[PDB]
């Protein structure tokens, strides 16, 4: 497994980040788990997970099942970094009561306790805004969150769908009284969405913070979904925004040439689209999304591949880049 | 329900907010439990209470009828931004023994502990200063507040009957030092008493402090006082502020204008008075001084209440208001 | 003379402050220099200006006035702690071109090379700002105001036509960054108008300004104006503030009620007026505004007025005050 | 003319900002200052203009034609909120020596001397960044500019071509040490080109400063540009306009434009610039008229109130992203 530090803190993180948003809705309990010991087995000691995963009457169900992996012992938790999130509604889906979503320090003091509750564990190592929340101010969040540092609940404190010029004004509020800021940005971000590359990825880097990439296969689009349009199964590529993309024209036709392109280079097309992650300046590591514990063996094979400058240029080709700003739409 | 954010800050409120004071001296416990169900069946999430309500030797009850509401369980905690106060002497009315008012470190200390006891909770959302008190500096109040913060036991700060100038110092004196400072200011205002306007909603306007507005009908007065002036019951409006006021002849005869000018136009006088304040730049909303359920419902019609611009410049006319300073004096 | 600190700060002035007002549209060059050197000869030490006065096609005459008077030698520039005021607009009379009135940067820069150059001199001692600029930024203002400290032109600045919560504001923010902030308000009081009680004079006394009350006998009502009100000449009492408060019958009768006492008690009520301001707290003094020498002689004289506490007690009922805010209107 | 504060600070602008770019190049010095004259006649008081315009080796030309504008008297300077840039390579157009261009103290302090000689003033009100440069921290720059401030040299600071996350960076930069930061952002904002909606604009509202687009027309393109396209100069008939109309889908897209406003009779210049004024947190357009008559037509357009039927048409022909990180995720 390769490490780096996460930016520029001291915490060391497997390039390959295991997310767990499948385990509940997709994949069940007992897979669940069996995926986080293959991924502590391989070196990955870095786990991605939210209050909401789970979705619907079963939102939280996803920190239930690593509360229960944590509590079969065996030092994994001493092991895992462990990040949650905070924003979402936890309540019935719908309008959210007043405060009981977003990033007031209302919402911030009651999410973290059942998150601390569902997940079995004394403190979160990572403890992410789902969202930004524009009608928070920074002094406000960075109050609710010195809390829960002093008190030892969490350790880090990083962001998740920010602008670029977010991540600027949070680290800029944190540092002018000693506070460490962001420490990562989790970004959606791969071959078929590259625009955190205009402002979210430049500023993370000048701010020195990581970056993980959500959804690295665009929800399994990018896995082969077209060879593997007409299989059964719950798969993630068969609903959402895959399925979206296959039912457009011209996105089909990119997924197309994508599977045709990497079928003549004897590559599978889920371990490029996360190798090809892995070349972004910046990237700290996708975060995979293993339905299953094959799955997993294959991202870890994806972070073993050296993709050549041959294919590097194809894929761009397929799926260009804007560039960072404000070059990417003046000069 | 209108919902707003209190000023510059995250946490989002009912633009009515409930007061509490009426709930002990005036209304049973039964009928309060009552009045607080229906508010938050009406989307209120926003309650305001002190340790002194209840008066007298039953200084505290109020606060106890809430915590005794809270202990039924159903979410009710949860939902709702509990708002009390500190400063009042909560001993034998007369004067207090050192330090058992005002705004020393010592007294919020024990007052705090005394309010969290009796409310049944162990936190309060937003802790308010009732008064200013001249004697203690905002290095000893931010450092007492502080405290609170980092140990849980509170979440926000607000100001009550405050200067401008005290929002602008004590919201400066915490900026310095990275803490939130005063999130909202509870200040009498209504269409009888319009001085507010003058420089304390300016400087709250400024600073981005939510307007909570306290006796919104000047203690019943502007809710059809002359009308139900023969009537019995044991109304607000019978004794107190709107008492004094009838006897005084040229603010008999205004608010003689006032409910003439609504029976013209078929609105209620409780209810125009709670919407003209709605209306108020700044305003967050009013605290409404509900005797019964009827009279919060009364209340939740109000803010659905649109007044005409004919209605608002005629209710100008008849409670003219000064303005900001120093145009309010000078030019 | 009588001397105090301005404030907080090291400047000693006479507590009679000489306004310069008159001097050009009422009062003619030579009697404003034998009005200047009156008051030089009797100890004050402090001259208000302004780059407005003169009036219309005029402005910017008695800056003129006072220059042709340094000009004369004799110490008379090292001697007097000079204050004009920028804000006011100095071109043709009705709407200014953009920036050329207000509290810009760019409109101080021209404001005060243009004041220097009609004053004489180079360097002013005190420079105001005429009236608050809701729409110009501390930060803003401080470094123009920065700029010409460190340039030598101006040493001290000050407020005029503030509300309480500006004056915190602006000495909170110089503060930040090390800069001196106002050293001195400049507001309208008297017996006539008291509502600067309310939260400037409380605010200014906070942050330690000298507190110059302008229009000290209320544009000359004050001055035996009704006594005088068929007397000739080009009388300030005969115009602006003081007509338009003797053509109110309440005023009027407010006016004769005080011209009556001090007949009674033997005392000229131009004296009693600057007598009253200088009892008042926190108040440096008043800024006289004699239209001829013998006014300042009799300003001079009020000086040296002790007012017994029976006439006192009478002006406080004749012409009451407000208080301090909040208990001016809540409690 | 409708005037606003810059941003959140204390100076007042006209909603319309006179560009200078053409003079020199495409309108000649007579006619850049009648064209001043009656900007100034109409109440604009907000003039944009940068070292490097003249182009090639007259390079400083524009700033020398404001200069004898100026030095006409009457008022002009005293009533001119006066704009100028640097970054730009002021010798040889190709590669410039080092630190002849871009954002070093150096290189500013060269600049700004330069700009002060062309243009016969002591002072420039808005001293603005060309173009971020990310090789020069912040901490220099605002070593460098508080030295002109002190000095009087300058007034205010602007950004031009600035990221959203440089225009934070900057003023929480200038705000810890007492500093006023950027005052205003001037970023290519028009109906063809909405991406700083993503994160430009919504940083500089937050922070305070005026927007102001510079290209309006996209260089001309929404002036008409495929009515004129066989006339006899035109700006529309090179650059930026002319590669759009090259383009088969961007043409489609003007000729769709240009229709649309066939029918409602308005013109197509003057909707593109009353487009702008629309638009939440802009200041204005800088206007660039190579004729006084176009002039004339943009204080037309200021005028003007666009129907909610045109403004949702203009929308679905120039849709833009909105804000990031909704425009690319959620
Ligand atoms: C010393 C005891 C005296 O008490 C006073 O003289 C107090 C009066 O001067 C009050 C305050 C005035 O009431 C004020 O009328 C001003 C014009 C207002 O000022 C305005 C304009 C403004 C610019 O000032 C602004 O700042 C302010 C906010 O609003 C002000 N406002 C707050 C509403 C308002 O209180 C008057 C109206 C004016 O004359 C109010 C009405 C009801 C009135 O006739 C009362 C008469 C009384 C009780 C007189 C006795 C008689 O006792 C007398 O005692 C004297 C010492 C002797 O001369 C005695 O001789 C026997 C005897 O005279 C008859
Ligand atoms: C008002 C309703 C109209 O809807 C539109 O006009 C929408 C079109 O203008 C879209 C947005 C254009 O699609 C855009 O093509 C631009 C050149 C790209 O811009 C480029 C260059 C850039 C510089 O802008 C850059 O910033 C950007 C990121 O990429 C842009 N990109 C975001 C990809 C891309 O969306 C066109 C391509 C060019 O025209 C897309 C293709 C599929 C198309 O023909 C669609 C036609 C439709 C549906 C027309 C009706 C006709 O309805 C008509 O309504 C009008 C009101 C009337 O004129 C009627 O005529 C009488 C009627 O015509 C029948
Ligand atoms: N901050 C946010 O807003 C946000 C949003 C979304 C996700 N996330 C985080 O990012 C993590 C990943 O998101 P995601 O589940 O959408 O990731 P993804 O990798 O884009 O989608 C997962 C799907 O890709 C396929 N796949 C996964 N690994 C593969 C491989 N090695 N080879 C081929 N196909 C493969 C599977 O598709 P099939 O099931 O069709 O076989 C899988 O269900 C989540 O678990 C969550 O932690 C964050
Ligand atoms: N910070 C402070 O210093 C301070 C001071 C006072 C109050 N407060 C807070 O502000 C809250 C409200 O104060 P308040 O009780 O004096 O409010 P208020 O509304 O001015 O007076 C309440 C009285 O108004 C009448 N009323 C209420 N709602 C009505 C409606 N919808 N229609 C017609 N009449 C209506 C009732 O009078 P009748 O009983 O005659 O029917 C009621 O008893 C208090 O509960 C307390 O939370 C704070
Ligand atoms: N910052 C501001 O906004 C502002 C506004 C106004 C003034 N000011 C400053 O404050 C200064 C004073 O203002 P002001 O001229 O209006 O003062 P004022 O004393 O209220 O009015 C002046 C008039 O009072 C009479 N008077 C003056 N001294 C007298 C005395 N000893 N005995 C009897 N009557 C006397 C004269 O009236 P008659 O002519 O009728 O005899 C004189 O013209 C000005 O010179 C100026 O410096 C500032
Ligand atoms: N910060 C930067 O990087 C940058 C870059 C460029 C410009 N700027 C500034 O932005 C200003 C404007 O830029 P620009 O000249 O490209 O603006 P523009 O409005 O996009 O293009 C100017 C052309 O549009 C046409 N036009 C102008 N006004 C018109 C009207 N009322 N009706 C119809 N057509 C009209 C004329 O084209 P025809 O000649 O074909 O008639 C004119 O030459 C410049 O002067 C400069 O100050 C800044």
């Known amino acids: 497994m390769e490490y780096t530090q996460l930016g520029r803190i001291g915490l060391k993180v497997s390039r390959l980040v295991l997310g767990t948003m499948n385990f509940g809705p997709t994949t069940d309990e007992a897979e669940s788990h069996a995926i986080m010991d293959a991924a502590l087995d391989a070196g990955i000691n870095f786990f991605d997970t939210a209050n909401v995963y789970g979705w ?87 109050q609710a969150m010195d809390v829960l540092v002093r008190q030892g609940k969490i350790l880090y404190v990083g962001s998740s769908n920010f602008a670029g010029w977010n991540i600027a004004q949070a680290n800029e509020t944190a540092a002018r009284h000693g506070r460490l800021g962001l420490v990562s940005e989790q970004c959606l971000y791969n071959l078929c969405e590259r625009r955190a590359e205009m402002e979210v990825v430049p500023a993370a880097r000048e701010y020195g913070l990581g970056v993980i990439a959500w959804s690295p296969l665009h929800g399994g689009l990018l896995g082969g979904a077209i060879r593997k349009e007409q299989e059964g199964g719950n798969r993630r590529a068969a609903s959402g925004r895959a399925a979206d993309a296959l039912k457009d024209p011209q996105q089909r036709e990119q997924i197309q040439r994508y599977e045709d392109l990497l079928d003549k280079h004897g590559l599978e097309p889920g371990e490029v689209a996360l190798a090809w992650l892995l070349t972004r300046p910046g990237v700290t590591g996708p975060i995979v999304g293993p339905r299953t514990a094959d799955q997993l063996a294959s991202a870890v094979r994806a972070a073993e591949l050296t993709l050549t400058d041959e294919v590097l240029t194809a894929l761009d080709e397929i799926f260009p880049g804007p560039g960072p700003s404000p070059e990417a739409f003046a000069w």
Do not use: C
């Open 56 to 142: 619907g009457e079963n939102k939280g169900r996803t920190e239930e099942i690593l509360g229960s992996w944590f509590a079969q012992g065996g030092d994994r938790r001493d092991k895992v970094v462990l990040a949650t999130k905070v924003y979402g509604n936890m309540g019935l889906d719908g309008p959210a009561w007043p405060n009981h979503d977003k990033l007031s320090a209302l919402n911030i003091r009651r999410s973290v306790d059942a998150s601390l509750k569902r997940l079995g564990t004394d403190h979160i190592d990572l403890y992410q805004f789902h969202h930004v929340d524009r009608d928070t101010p920074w002094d406000e969040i960075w």
